[PDB]
Design a protein around this ligand. Structure first.
Ligand SMILES: Nc1ncnc2c1ncn2[C@@H]1O[C@H](COP(=O)(O)OP(=O)(O)O)[C@@H](O)[C@H]1O
Ligand SMILES: Nc1ncnc2c1ncn2[C@@H]1O[C@H](COP(=O)(O)OP(=O)(O)O)[C@@H](O)[C@H]1O
Lengths: 684, 684
C-alpha cells in the first residue's frame, strides 16, 4: 500500500533505490540457506536479461505483423488479385502488364483506359481513403485515447520519472498497433517507424508486469523502457547501434551505464526477429533498405551546404508553423470535431494526392524511388533523357513541374496532419521532403552544368560522355538534413542513416549537411520539434540546456510566499486521528513535513498524503508519532538543502538523483518546499 | 589565487561548475558588442574540438614514433643490416638466407653455425638485454619517477577528480615515451599498447595548458582526459569504437554524455594519424592486425567453456599472486634496490627466454604466430604434420613439450615483472598467455580426434581428408578469455577485439569464453587487477559496486567523535588578523565552517584553509566577516545534508555531483564534516 504514485506525477528515485536495497538485503538473507533459494535468486538475476529478451522478441513480432498488414492494406487502395486474394499487387506481379492483378474500373466498368476509368479509380481512391481514415479514427477514439500523437514526447517524459498509467497499458498495445496499421494504410503524411517505439515500449511494460521486481520498482521499469526505446527505434530503422544511441540521445533521461548492454541486446534481438520474419518471401529488413556504389567529388561539396540551408531553414519554418497550428487547432471550435477534422484532412490528401504521380504512391516507395538513380532498365518520366554532358529532352521540364508541385504539396499537407487524433510520425515526412529537395537540386545542377559546361569551373571536373553528378546522394543528404533540421538530431541520426544505408563513402556529405542544418535551425529556436511538442503539452520536462541569468537563490522560490497562506505541517503528541481526518479533508496537498510543535517550526521528518491516509484508516479499522504509536511508518530522514542555496545546485541535485521535492530550512527551522512543478513554473 | 587545489587531493566539481557559470556570464556580457568579441567567442567554442583534435594528432604521432623505435631497437637485439644500417632485419630481408643481415657471431667469430656461434649470440643477447633494462631503469629513476607501473590506475583516479601535478607534466611525456620504447626493446613481459594511453593523456594535458578555458577548469580538463583515454586505447589497439567504449567502462568516472562525440572524434583522429604514418613502408595499422575467413562448428562449443575455466582460473590465480608479491616486494629490503631488481628480472628473462624458441621472439610476434594457422608455405616445427584425420609426425610431441614450457615460463615470469620501476602493461602478457593456452588445447583436441575418430561424437562432424578444427580461433578465444579474466572486461574488451580482428563470425565464442572467465573470476575476488592495484596504492576511488550491510547513518561518521578533539571553526567579529594567523599556524586541517559564535554552533558559512590563508596575507599586505570587511570573499552557501541521513544517500550525492566534503548539522547546529577520505576509511 505504501509507495504508490498517483497518475500524472513524477517519481522520486532515491526512495525506489532504498526499496531495491532492502529487497536485496532480504534476498541475501535467505540466499545461501537452501538450493531452492539459490534457484530463485538466479531466476531473479536473469530476469534482467529476460525482460529485454521478451521485449525485443515481442517488438519484432509486432513490427512484422504491422508491416505486413500495412503494406497489404495500402495495396488494397489500388486493386485486387483475383487469382490470389491474400497476396498484394507486387506479389502477383512478380508471381510469374499483370492480368491477374485487376483494378476496380475494369472490375465494374470493364474499361482499363480513358476518362471514365480514370474518374472511377479516382473516386474510389478518395472513398477508400475516407473509409480507412474514418474507421481508424473511430477505433482510436472509442477504444484508446492515448494512441494520439507520435509517442516520442510521452516516452521522453515517462523515462524521466513521469507516470501515465494508461499510456502504456495492456489495452493500448492492440489498439495502437491496429490504428497505426490502418492510418499508414490511408497514406496520410505519417509513418509507422517512429511511433512503433511506443509499441515496443508497451511490450516491456506488459511483460514487466509478470516479474514483481521490475513492477513495484519504478526505476527498474524506467530502465526497461529505456532499453525498449532503443529496441523499437532499431526495429523501425533497422539500426541497432543507431537504436541504442537514440535512447541515450533523445529518449532516455537517466542512464547508469550498467544497462547499455541491455539496450544493445534489445536492439539486436528486435532487429534479428524483424529480419527473420518474412512469411511472404520478402528479403529486405525494411521496405527501403538500399545500398550504393556511386562516387562523389570534392567540388561537389559546395551544393550540399546550399541544400543544407534548406535542410535547416525548412526545419525552422516547420517548427514555427505546425507548433503554431497545433496550438490554434486546440483552442478554436475545430478542436471539438476530431473525426470530422481528420476526415476532412484525409479527403484533402487523397483528392490532391492521386493526380500527382509521386504523391499517389506510398511515401516509403517515393523515398525509395528518389534514393535510387535511374536504373539501366528504368524508363520512367523521372529520367527524361534522350556532347560532354548527356542530352536532356523537353519532358524534363514537365518532370520538374510535377516534382516541384509534389514538393509544394508534401511541405504543406504534412504541417496540418501531425496534430490529428491518429497514429503518426515525423520521420517519413521529413525524409520524403528532404529527398525530394535533393532530387530537385541534383537535376537542377545537372542541367546547369549541361548548359554552361564551357566554364573553367566545370570543364576540369565533369568528364565527357559520362554522368558527372549523382542525384541519389543528393536525395540521401537532403533527407538526412531535413530530418536533422526538424528534430535537431546530429549524431544518432547519422548512425541510423549509416546502418539503414550501408557505405561509408557518403558519411562526409551527410555530416556536413546535418551540421549545417542544425546550425541554421538553432538560430530559429534551439528546441527540437519533440521538445516544443512536450512544451505545448506542458509536461514536466527538466531541461538540461537552460541557463540562469539572475544570480538568484531558492530564497526567491521556496514556498509559501508573503502572498500565499502557510504550509500545512503535522505534530506528534497533541494531535489525534480525528484532527488528521479533518486536516486531510480540509487540505488538497501531497507532502507534509512533520515538526515537534507549531512554535518551533523545526524540521524533524517528512511524509506524504497517501501514506498518511492509508495508514490512518488502516489503524482506525484495526496518537504519538515521536519516540498506539505510529512512529515506525513515519519517515524520519528526508533530504534537505540550505535555504540560501543557489537555484542551479538545487536543479542539478534534482536532475542527478531524481527527487520529486526537497525541503528548505533556516537554522533548522523549516521554511518551505520546492517541487519539480514549481521549478518549471519559475522556468517560464 | 582562490580555487587552487593542493597536489594529492580530490576536486570539488560543483564549485568548478559555478566558476564555469560565472565565466559564461562574463563572456555573454560582451558577446554582441563588436565583431572581435564574436570571433573570440567562436574561438572559445571551437576550443572544445581543437583540444581533442590536437590531442589525437599528437597521440598518433607519438604512437608511430614509439612503434618504429621499438621495432628498430628490439630488432637490433638480434643483429645488424650492414648494407643499410637504418633499416631493420625484416625490411632488409624483404628488400630484395639474408646475407645483408648479419649477426654477432659472424661479425666477430665469422662462423654462423656451431656451438661457438650459438654461445656468442646467446651471451650477446643477454648482454644487450641487460643494457636496455639498465638504461631504461636509470633514465626513469633519474628523470621521471611517475613513469612506473602501467598507468591505468592513476588515470582512473585522475578522471574521478584526483590531482597529481607531476603525473602528466610537460616532462613526463618525453621520458615516458623513451623509457617505454627502451623497455619493450628489452623484450620483458610487458607491452607498449596499454601504457600508451598515459602518453596520449599527457598530450591532452599539455595542450590543455595553451587554452585558459580548459586549464583553470578542472572538470573540463577531466573531460579532455577522458577523451584522450579513448584516443590512446584506440591507438594502442586500433579500435576507435573500442576506445570510446573503454573510456566509459574502465577509465572515466563522470560522463555527461555531451562529450561522447569528443571521445569518438579523438579516437578517429588518433587512428587516422596512426594508420597514415608509416614512413618505412608499413601497411598494417598495428603489428598484429589480422583477418580471418575460417569457419567453426557448433559441436566445437564444449571446449571453449573448458578453456574459459582456465581463462577464468588463471585470472583468479594471477590477481591473487602478483597483488601478493607486489605487496611483499614493497615491504622487504628488495624494495630499496629498484635498478638492481630490474636488472635481475631482465637477466632472468633473457637467460630463460632465448633457449625456448617462442620466448626468444618478441611477444607481439609470438601472439601473431599463435593467431595465424599454418599457412600453405608454412614449414615451421609448430606445424609438424606429414585416413579421415590428417597424419601427425613425431615432431608434434616435441612442439608440445617446448610450447608447454613456454606457457609455464610466461605464466611464471609475468607475475614478477608488473611491479617494476619501468613502463609495463598487462594487455600483452595476458593476450600471449591466453593465446598459448588456446593453441595448446587446439592441438590436444586435434590429436584426440585423430586417435579416437571412431567414436560417434566425431564421425558425424569431422570430415575425411580435411582439417576439422581451427586452432587459430582457439588462440583468439584463449587470449580474449584470459584478458577478460584478469582485467575483468566483458564488453569493451570484446568490441576492441572485434575491431582489432575483423569478422563477425567469431563473436559467439568470444562472448561465451569472456562471460565464462568473468563468472569464474568473480568467485575469487570481484575486483579487477587494475582495481586491485588502485586499492594497493590506496588512492581515493569511490567504488560504485559496494553494498552497506548495516543500516548506518551519517551520525556514525560525522566528525569529531567522542574520542577526538573538537573541530576547528571560525568567528566573524571578535576575530582579527593575529588570532586567525595563530589559529592557522596551530592547525593542520583543510576545511573550516564559519559560525556566528562559539555558543550557538549554528552553521552559517564555509571556507578552505588555503583560500583563507591567502586572503589573510593579502589583506595584511594591503575584522568583521558578517554583513575593513572580508564578508565578500567568504563563501556563504555551502552544501549541507541532514545529520540523520543514511550514508548511502551521502555517498550517492558525492559520486553524482562530485563534492570533496559535506557538512552535517543538527537542528541547524553544525556537528561535523565528512570527506571522501573518511568515507573510504569506513569502507574498509
Ligand atoms: N499556498 C501555499 N503555502 C505553502 N506551501 C505551498 C502553497 N502552495 C504550494 N505549496 C507547496 O508546493 C507544493 C506543491 O507543488 P507541486 O509539485 O505543484 O505539487 P506536489 O507538491 O503535490 O508535487 C506543496 O507540496 C506545498 O508544500
Ligand atoms: N579530531 C577531529 N575533530 C574534528 N574534526 C575532524 C577531526 N579529524 C578530522 N576531522 C574532519 O575531517 C576532515 C579531514 O578529512 P580528510 O578528507 O582526511 O582530509 P581533508 O578534509 O583535508 O580532505 C577535516 O576537514 C575535519 O573537518
Amino acid at each position: 500500500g505504501v509507495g504508490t504514485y498517483d497518475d500524472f506525477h513524477t517519481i522520486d528515485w532515491v526512495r525506489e533505490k532504498c526499496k531495491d536495497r532492502e529487497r536485496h538485503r532480504r534476498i541475501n538473507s535467505k540466499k545461501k540457506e537452501s538450493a531452492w533459494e539459490m534457484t530463485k535468486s538466479l531466476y531473479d538475476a536473469w530476469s534482467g536479461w529476460l525482460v529485454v529478451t521478451l521485449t525485443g522478441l515481442a517488438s519484432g513480432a509486432l513490427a512484422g505483423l504491422i508491416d505486413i498488414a500495412a503494406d497489404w492494406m495500402t495495396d488494397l487502395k489500388e486493386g485486387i488479385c483475383l487469382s490470389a486474394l491474400w497476396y498484394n499487387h507486387e506479389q502477383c506481379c512478380w508471381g510469374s502488364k499483370c492480368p491477374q492483378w485487376k483494378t476496380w474500373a475494369e472490375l465494374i466498368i470493364g474499361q482499363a483506359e480513358g476518362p471514365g476509368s480514370y474518374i472511377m479509380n479516382y473516386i474510389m481512391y478518395i472513398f477508400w481513403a475516407l473509409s480507412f481514415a474514418f474507421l481508424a479514427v473511430s477505433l482510436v477514439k472509442v477504444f484508446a485515447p492515448y494512441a494520439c500523437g507520435s509517442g516520442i514526447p510521452e516516452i521522453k517524459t515517462i523515462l524521466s520519472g513521469f507516470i501515465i498509467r494508461g499510456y502504456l497499458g495492456k489495452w493500448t498495445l492492440m489498439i495502437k498497433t491496429i490504428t497505426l496499421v490502418l492510418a499508414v494504410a490511408s497514406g496520410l503524411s505519417l509513418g509507422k517507424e517512429g511511433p512503433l517505439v511506443h509499441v515496443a515500449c508497451c511490450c516491456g511494460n506488459i511483460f514487466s508486469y509478470l516479474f514483481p521486481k521490475y513492477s513495484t520498482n519504478e526505476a527498474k521499469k524506467r530502465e526497461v523502457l529505456s532499453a525498449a526505446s532503443a529496441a523499437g527505434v532499431s526495429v523501425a530503422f533497422g539500426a541497432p547501434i543507431g537504436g541504442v544511441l537514440f535512447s541515450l540521445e533523445e529518449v532516455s533521461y537517466y542512464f547508469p551505464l550498467k544497462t547499455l548492454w541491455r539496450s544493445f541486446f534489445a536492439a539486436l534481438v528486435a532487429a534479428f526477429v524483424l529480419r527473420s520474419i518474412n512469411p511472404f518471401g520478402n528479403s529486405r529488413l525494411v521496405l527501403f533498405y538500399v545500398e550504393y556504389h556511386t562516387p562523389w567529388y570534392l567540388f561537389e561539396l559546395f551544393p550540399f551546404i546550399l541544400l543544407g540551408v534548406f535542410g535547416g531553414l525548412w526545419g525552422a519554418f516547420f517548427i514555427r508553423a505546425n507548433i503554431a497550428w497545433c496550438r490554434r487547432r486546440k483552442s478554436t471550435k475545430f478542436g471539438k470535431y476530431p473525426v470530422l477534422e481528420v476526415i476532412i484532412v484525409a479527403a484533402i490528401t487523397a483528392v490532391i494526392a492521386f493526380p500527382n504521380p509521386y504523391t499517389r504512391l506510398n511515401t516509403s516507395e517515393l523515398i525509395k524511388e528518389l534514393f535510387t538513380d535511374c536504373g539501366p532498365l528504368e524508363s520512367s518520366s523521372l529520367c527524361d533523357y534522350r556532347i560532354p554532358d548527356r542530352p536532356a529532352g523537353v519532358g524534363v521540364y514537365s518532370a520538374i513541374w510535377q516534382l516541384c508541385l509534389a514538393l509544394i504539396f508534401k511541405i504543406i499537407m504534412t504541417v496540418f496532419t501531425f496534430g490529428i487524433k491518429v497514429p503518426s510520425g515525423l520521420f517519413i515526412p521529413s525524409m520524403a521532403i528532404g529527398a525530394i529537395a535533393g532530387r530537385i537540386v541534383g537535376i537542377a545542377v545537372e542541367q546547369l552544368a549541361y548548359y554552361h559546361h564551357d566554364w573553367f569551373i566545370f570543364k576540369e571536373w565533369c568528364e565527357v560522355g559520362a554522368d558527372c553528378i549523382t542525384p541519389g546522394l543528393y536525395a540521401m543528404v537532403g533527407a538526412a538534413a531535413c530530418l536533422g533540421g526538424v528534430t535537431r538530431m546530429t549524431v544518432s541520426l547519422v548512425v541510423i542513416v549509416f546502418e539503414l544505408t550501408g557505405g561509408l563513402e557518403y558519411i562526409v556529405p551527410l555530416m556536413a549537411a546535418v551540421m549545417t542544418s542544425k546550425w541554421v535551425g538553432d538560430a530559429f529556436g534551439r528546441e527540437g520539434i519533440y521538445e516544443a511538442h512536450i512544451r505545448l503539452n506542458g509536461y514536466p520536462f527538466l531541461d538540461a540546456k537552460e541557463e540562469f541569468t539572475h544570480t538568484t537563490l531558492a530564497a526567491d522560490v521556496m514556498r509559501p510566499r508573503r502572498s500565499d497562506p502557510p504550509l500545512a505541517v503535522l505534530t506528534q503528541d497533541n494531535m489525534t486521528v480525528d484532527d488528521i481526518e479533518n486536516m486531510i479533508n480540509e487540505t488538497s496537498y501531497n507532502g507534509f513535513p512533520v515538526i515537534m510543535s507549531k512554535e518551533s517550526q523545526r524540521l524533524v521528518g517528512f511524509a506524504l498524503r497517501r501514506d498518511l491516509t492509508i495508514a490512518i484508516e488502516s489503524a482506525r479499522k484495526k496518537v504519538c508519532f515521536a519516540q498506539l504509536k505510529l512512529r515506525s511508518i513515519l519517515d524520519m530522514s528526508p533530504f534537505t538543502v540550505t535555504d540560501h542555496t543557489p537555484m542551479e545546485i538545487v536543479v542539478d541535485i534534482f536532475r542527478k538523483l531524481g527527487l520529486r521535492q526537497c525541503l528548505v530550512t533556516h537554522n533548522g527551522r523549516l521554511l518551505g518546499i520546492i517541487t519539480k512543478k514549481d521549478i518549471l513554473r519559475h522556468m517560464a
